[PDB]
């Protein structure tokens, strides 16, 4: 699933570099639907929120 993979991967980068990247990425692709997930308007928005914290804790399963 693309949506979960981009969520998981974007969350990973924002988890390492900090939430300062969430803002950058969100505003850098605000019109692009590939990043619509970063806004609360998307259904998986809540899923991504968890991924960030999870990658920070270093417990989640990286993608394949």
């Amino acid at each position: 699933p693309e949506v979960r993979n981009i969520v998981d991967k974007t969350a990973s980068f924002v988890a390492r570099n900090g939430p300062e990247f969430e803002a950058r990425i969100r505003q850098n692709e605000i019109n692009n639907p590939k990043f619509n997930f970063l806004n609360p308007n998307d259904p998986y928005h809540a899923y991504y929120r968890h991924k960030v914290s999870e990658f920070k804790e270093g417990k989640a399963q990286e993608p394949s």
Binding site: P1, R4, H50, E54, E57, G58, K59, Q61, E62, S64
Partner: protein, 428 residues
């Protein structure tokens, strides 16, 4: 008479009357046994008739069991059915099937009607049986689980009927009747709940996954359509039947969707994951990218399964796929979700995965990552094992710094062995 115990006085009066005539032979004993209805005494007249001296009444079984067995409908009908049950006059069996007393009941008249259909099976089988099934087949409009249970019971009696021609025709029409209308008309049931009964009748009609055949390629879709939303008591057996009739990827994807929509969380979704790995190997092909994409897509976030598995299926499958690169990425991403319960199992699985691949630097990164995540004894045991492993190989700087890190963690308790072992290792 006013109330009870008058028919008991007339009862014993018939006990001293034990032979009152040359014709009926004290019929007042059974006539007294039929007194009132139920829940008063009912044991006095029968107990007297059998209490004359002793022989056997042979009347008192059907006379005491003939007065309202099962308030209203209830197991009391079996008491009236117990006297001369296999045969007495070849008559009182109708009294055993006689209950009446209409009241509020669910399942009792249907189960007792199926038992009365078995007594009809000892009555000459199909004689009067079809009239009982047709009479008990329609009760109000749907809105009952006893209807389809009695029709399914007639389907089991049709399985006892040997040849499946007529049993398959009558079970096909009677099984096709709920397809138009199922349940949820009026009652205390908020929903219809046609999965249990409707899927049981459809399963008894075709695709039993045991012995009986005559299951069309569309019969599996007839069961999935019989549930009409989701059902997963049989999801394993239903997907196994669809795999028996087809054995393709369409039945695997339909089993994954039926398992996901079946029940939330890895209840039927865990079986959908097992069937996703087995179906991924036996259908989608070995070492397929789409198999890992779907397996990682459905199980991505997940709760911790039974105990936990976020990895071994996808991590071992990725390590055995022939790619040493994505195996390490799945080892780190699998290491983030490794132990939500902070168990040393997944910790030793990640440290072992980093031990069998890459090398020293990977064991150092796994040492810093293992020391970062801490619950109680996790960081102390992992930092101690990786500390001794690093001191036995690398320099003593990681042993001294690992000892300083062991001072801030590993609450004193008793201990004392790690300090002397670290001091001896520093002396060496």
């Amino acid at each position: 008479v006013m109330t009870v115990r008058d028919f008991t006085q007339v009862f014993d009066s018939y006990a001293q009357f034990e032979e009152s005539m040359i014709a009926a032979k004290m019929e007042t004993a059974s006539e007294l046994g039929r007194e009132e209805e139920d829940d008063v005494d009912l044991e006095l007249r029968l107990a007297r008739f059998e209490q004359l001296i002793s022989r056997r009444p042979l009347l008192l079984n059907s006379v005491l069991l003939r007065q309202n067995p099962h308030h209203v409908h209830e197991w009391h009908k079996r008491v009236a059915l117990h006297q001369g049950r296999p045969r007495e006059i070849i008559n009182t069996y109708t009294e055993a099937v006689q209950t009446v007393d209409p009241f509020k009941a669910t399942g009792k008249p249907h189960t007792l009607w199926v038992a009365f259909a078995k007594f009809y099976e000892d009555n000459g089988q199909l004689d009067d049986a079809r009239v009982i099934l047709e009479k008990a087949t329609k009760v109000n409009f749907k809105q009952v689980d006893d209807l389809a249970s009695v029709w399914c019971q007639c389907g089991e009696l049709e399985l006892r009927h040997e040849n499946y021609d007529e049993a398959l025709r009558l079970l096909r029409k009677a099984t096709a009747l709920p397809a138009r209308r199922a349940e949820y008309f009026d009652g205390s049931e908020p929903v219809q709940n046609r999965v249990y009964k409707s899927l049981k009748v459809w399963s008894m009609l075709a695709d039993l996954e045991e012995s009986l055949g005559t299951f069309q390629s569309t019969k599996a879709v007839y069961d999935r359509i019989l549930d009409l939303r989701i059902a997963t008591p049989q999801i394993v057996i239903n997907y196994a039947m669809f795999l028996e009739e087809h054995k393709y990827f369409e039945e695997s994807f339909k089993a994954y969707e039926r398992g996901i929509s079946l029940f939330k969380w890895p209840n039927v979704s865990d079986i959908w994951s097992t069937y996703l790995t087995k179906f991924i190997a036996r259908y989608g092909g070995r070492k397929l990218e789409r198999a890992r994409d779907l397996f990682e897509q459905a199980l991505d976030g997940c709760p911790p399964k039974y105990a936990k598995t976020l990895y071994l299926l996808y991590a071992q499958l990725e390590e055995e796929w022939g790619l040493a690169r994505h195996a390490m990425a799945v080892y780190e991403r699998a290491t983030r979700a490794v132990e939500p319960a902070q168990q040393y199992d997944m910790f030793n699985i990640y440290i072992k995965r980093a031990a069998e691949i890459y090398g020293v630097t990977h064991t150092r990164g796994i040492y810093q990552k293992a020391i970062e995540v801490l619950s109680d004894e996790h960081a102390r045991e992992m930092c101690l094992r990786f500390a001794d492993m690093e001191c036995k190989l690398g320099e003593i700087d990681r042993a001294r710094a690992i000892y300083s890190f062991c001072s801030q963690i590993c609450d004193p308790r008793t201990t004392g062995a790690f300090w002397q072992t670290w001091k001896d290792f520093e002396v060496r």
